Structure 1
């Protein structure tokens, strides 16, 4: 999930999670408009502090000062809660990154064909994230990661991993500061959306170029024309 789409208005996503009384997020009618969100950019990230939901632009990536590789962008659900590197983020830096769907590139010989993956029921996805608090500082090295899970069923045809997507109800509980890391591990297990809830189709190769951000990037295409 090295790219995803976050294109609709804030209300389009937040209405599934909480009414205004629970938010500390200004009204804004403008669609976010990003059909091709990439690592290293700041992404509107949802979290809870001071008993309200906040939406902060947070660097997609995590690279402590001691980390000598490109920033990580994912953390595996299998191990993140006990990882020496991720355990504090699992306990104190949980967040949600909402989106319309995500992209994966399927290997077809020496060619790589992009696919867009989304909920068959037409809801947005609430991706489980962990990251470095305080999110509002706008850090440019230690931001957030998208938690991943194994692909199963038809999704394995496309790629072997996928974002850990939570139900709206589970996403709301995941963000609460009052629940422990152990409780969060239970939420991740019980609230994960299974693979048969997703649909997918090939899309234009143009999504590979981050200059492109338009709605055409999630439209289905014939592979034969690419």
Structure 2
């Protein structure tokens, strides 16, 4: 999973991230760096997407079940990385295989420090490789949804896709803001998706999964990794090739055909 849609206006996104802390207080997650939120139908690696993380990553003594929402760089840049510019990274951290995560230098260390985040999207795109043709068929893939008038109604009630991520913090040698960057954990595609692609993102389905993944305060790596697996609770439709070029940011990207 190397492309998402995350196009909602910031306040609509934030309201769609309404949740309950461990005490059952209804809350909206508190923003950091909201100016870096860049809505688009076509989010590629190296772009910023909003992710949820525990408040306790940002505030001493916080309730770890409280949530921050913050734009992060898609493509995990490890703390130790030595060059001036993130883009010089010579290995792909767009994704992080679940099967090998504990053996991977770039992911184990930040995972170990509790740096679990939830990557938000409308949904993700996958390109289907079909036998004996180089033509790839793009699909938009998303949580099942409630079953220009309809458009506004749909998107107000949209259930955002919640993907399990890991993030790391990098101080540019040259100097600047700390870079927060993320990888989306991958697992085997479910039966529903297996004729489209062998890989899918690790989807956290519902508030229990999202909560336990976020809460590095109360939930160990070993307990968190149990949430990482495929889900059949997923739907999709084929979309035009408009999505293919990551410069194309329009509704046509995720329109059915």
The alignment's TM-score, normalised by the length of structure 2, stands at 0.73
Please, what is the CA RMSD of the aligned residues? 2.8
- The aligned length equals 212
Listed one character per residue, the Cα deviations across residues 99-141 of structure 1 (whole Å, up to 9, x for unaligned) are 1110001123111121111122453211000010479x452xx
SS in 2 for 1:172: helix
Give the secondary structure class of the aligned counterpart of 2:99.
coil
Gaps of 5+ in 2: 83-87, 147-158, 172-176
Q: 2:231 aligns with which of 187, 194, 201?
A: 194
Matching residue within 70, 95, 112 for 1:74: 95
Rg larger in structure: 2
Q: What is the CA-CA distance between 1:88 and the residue it aligns to?
A: 1.7
Match of 2:134 among 110, 119, 134: 110
Q: How does 1:129-208 map to 2 (within 5 A)?
A: 129-133=165-169, 137-139=177-179, 143-167=181-205, 168-178=207-217, 179-188=219-228, 192=229, 194-195=231-232, 197-208=233-244
Q: Which residue of 2 aligns with 1:6?
A: 6
TM-score, normalised to structure 1, is: 0.82
53-62 vs 115-124, which moves further: 115-124
Q: CA deviation at 1:154?
A: 2.8
Deviates more, 1:93-102 or 1:44-53: 44-53
Q: Contact 1:13/1:98 (CA < 8 Å) preserved in 2?
A: no
| Contact 1:33–1:213, Cα closer than 8 Å, also in 2 | no
Call closer, same or farther: CA 1:22–1:220 in 2, change over 3 Å: closer
Structure 1 unaligned residues grouped into runs of 5+: 222-226
Residue 183 of structure 1 aligns to a residue whose secondary structure is: helix
Q: CA deviation at 1:172?
A: 1.4
Q: Deviations over 1:181-224 (max 9, x none)?
A: 11211233xxx5612x1111110101111221122211111xxx
Q: 1:152 & 1:23 partners in 2: Cα distance?
A: 31
2:160 maps to what in 1? 124
Is residue 55 from structure 1 mapped to residue 76 from structure 2 by the alignment? no
